[PDB]
Amino acid sequence: VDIVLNPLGVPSRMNIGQILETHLGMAAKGIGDKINAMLKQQQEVAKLRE
């Protein structure tokens, strides 16, 4: 990890992004990790097409 913060400001001011935006962020990168998989394994265009 390169950055480290604290959602201690949430229970105090309603900037719920720290809990959430982070959660979903990793989600979208996860899908990318399988794209990573479906290419690093030398897969045909049909597999990743579906």
Partner: protein
């Protein structure tokens, strides 16, 4: 039970009964040990906690 104002009056009686200097040395050393245990107690947040 140890609390913010509790540990506050800790040093207050310490000073109002003994003196200044003993309070100085006191404060410093606690600071170092305090940080140690604070590390061991990483208060997590974000969806998960």
């Amino acid at each position: 039970a140890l609390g913010k104002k509790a540990i506050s009056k800790m040093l207050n009686t310490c000073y109002r009964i003994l003196g200044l200097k003993p309070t100085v040395i006191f404060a410093d050393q606690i600071m170092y040990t305090g940080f140690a245990y604070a590390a061991r107690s990483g208060a997590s947040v974000g969806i998960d906690d």
